[PDB]
Amino acid sequence: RRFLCGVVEGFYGRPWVMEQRKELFRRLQKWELNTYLYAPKDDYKHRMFWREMYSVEEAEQLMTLISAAREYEIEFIYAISPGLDITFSNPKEVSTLKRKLDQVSQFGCRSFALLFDDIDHNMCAADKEVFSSFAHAQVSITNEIYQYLGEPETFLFCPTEYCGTFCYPNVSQSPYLRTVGEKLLPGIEVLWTGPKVVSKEIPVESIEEVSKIIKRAPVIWDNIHANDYDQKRLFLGPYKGRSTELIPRLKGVLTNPNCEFEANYVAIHTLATWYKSNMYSPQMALKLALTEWLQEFGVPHQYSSREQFVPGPNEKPLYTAEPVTLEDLQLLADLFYLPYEHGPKGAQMLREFQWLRANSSVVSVNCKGKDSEKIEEWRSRAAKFEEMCGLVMGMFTRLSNCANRTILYDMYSYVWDIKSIMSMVKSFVQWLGCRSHSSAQFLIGDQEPWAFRGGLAGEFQRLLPIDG
């Protein structure tokens, strides 16, 4: 029994380059994964201009990539999303799609996929006069394409309702899914993402409910680490919430990585472990992933003293960089953890800061003459918060010194923003703690720079109501 397990490049934004893809293939072979799906959203010949034919240079790049995939024995699936503007009752569209897929096949590609995600539910008059339903047209064209290609072993189809929240009026009673399941050829696999576009967790019964309609085990398109729906978010936490019992009931698992290429290492590793368990503990998986990931940071750059200056007792010490340690990576992971929850350490820091803010009046003004226990407790908790902020700043400082700076350079902005805001919070907490004897305004320099934090986007964000 073959099982699909791997990565889908299907995020918006700047696409990955050939070097990154080759390194990804090497890592996938190391981690015992077998599937790579190529459907980058912002590739003009993939989705928006699918009708065009690849140029010679693009053809050479594709052939090199496919041969590299062959070297590492990673299945390579090429996807097309013609649903943006394709007309189903016009044979010219079908002929063009066939020619495009044949050009892809002549490069040595073996597996193909057709996607109809994120399109409209309307049909032109030309198709409404032929097909009884939208699903009917989609299934008919998919079946014809599948039969033309010679019935490859692997073939993926993404329905238009790829999540429960897009099923109307529900999953079991959706006419679209019923028609697709009835009329689709048995040899094609079907993508599914769970109850929601970004599903926090997958109950087992939902998969069975979907399978009762599609009459086949689906292939999971998991967006647990996708970050193209709000690109301020970075996700470095482990794979979590998916019970292993789904493995016998699924035909494959395919993960959507973060837009930043180097930020997905841990995620992919966790996924492999999650698979390799049952051919599972999130905490252990994350520990192993970070332990393996640390080896790629190497050592920080240091002065090369291969007639060499050595300082004396009264000379200023040389600049020395400290290595990046396990604790720094764990703190980084907790700072950017999961879409629906934070890491334990970051959540605890936030709760402690909120508590300190709430009880500022205990010692803010004229603390002398008040209850000693409250003063000591508040000051101690403030000190612990200060130490954690210092840990964050030291993490950033040590990460800045890595010899292999590329790992940091692909996610520089997020860590830089979090360390800046931690510094500002530390300054604010100090100002709160010194109010009883310092009546000056809680300024940084001569001003309050956070009045411009986030600019116009930050200002608009600040006015959105929340319950807490």
UniProtKB/Swiss-Prot annotation:
Annotated protein name in UniProt: Protein O-GlcNAcase
Chemical reaction(s) catalysed: 3-O-(N-acetyl-beta-D-glucosaminyl)-L-seryl-[protein] + H2O = N-acetyl-D-glucosamine + L-seryl-[protein]; 3-O-(N-acetyl-beta-D-glucosaminyl)-L-threonyl-[protein] + H2O = L-threonyl-[protein] + N-acetyl-D-glucosamine
Tissue-level expression: Ubiquitous. Shows highest expression in the brain, placenta and pancreas.
Active site: 118 (proton donor)
Similarity section: Belongs to the glycosyl hydrolase 84 family.
Class of this enzyme: hydrolase
Regulation: Inhibited by N-acetylglucosamine and not N-acetylgalactosamine.
Effect of residue 450 to N: Nearly abolishes enzyme activity
E.C. no: 3.2.1.169
One GO location term (cellular component): nucleus
Effect of residue 229 to S: Nearly abolishes enzyme activity
Disulfide bonds: none
Reported pH dependence: Optimum pH is 5.7-7.
Lineage, opening ranks: Eukaryota, Metazoa, Chordata, Craniata, Vertebrata
Residues binding a protein, per UniProt: 10, 41, 117-118, 162, 228, 256
Gene Ontology MF annotations: [protein]-3-O-(N-acetyl-D-glucosaminyl)-L-serine/L-threonine O-N-acetyl-alpha-D-glucosaminase activity; beta-N-acetylglucosaminidase activity; hyalurononglucosaminidase activity; identical protein binding
PTM section of the record: Proteolytically cleaved by caspase-3 during apoptosis. The fragments interact with each other; cleavage does not decrease enzyme activity.
Binding partners and assembly: Monomer. Interacts with CLOCK. (Microbial infection) Interacts with human T-cell leukemia virus 1/HTLV-1 protein Tax; this interaction increases Tax interacting partner CREB1 O-GlcNAcylation.
Domain of life of the native organism: Eukaryota
Gene Ontology BP annotations: glycoprotein catabolic process; glycoprotein metabolic process; N-acetylglucosamine metabolic process; protein deglycosylation; protein O-linked glycosylation
Effect seen on changing residue 12 to S: Strongly reduces affinity for glycopeptide substrates. Nearly abolishes enzyme activity
Keyword terms of this UniProt record: Cytoplasm, Glycosidase, Host-virus interaction, Hydrolase, Nucleus, Phosphoprotein
Ranges where the GH84 domain occurs: 3-279
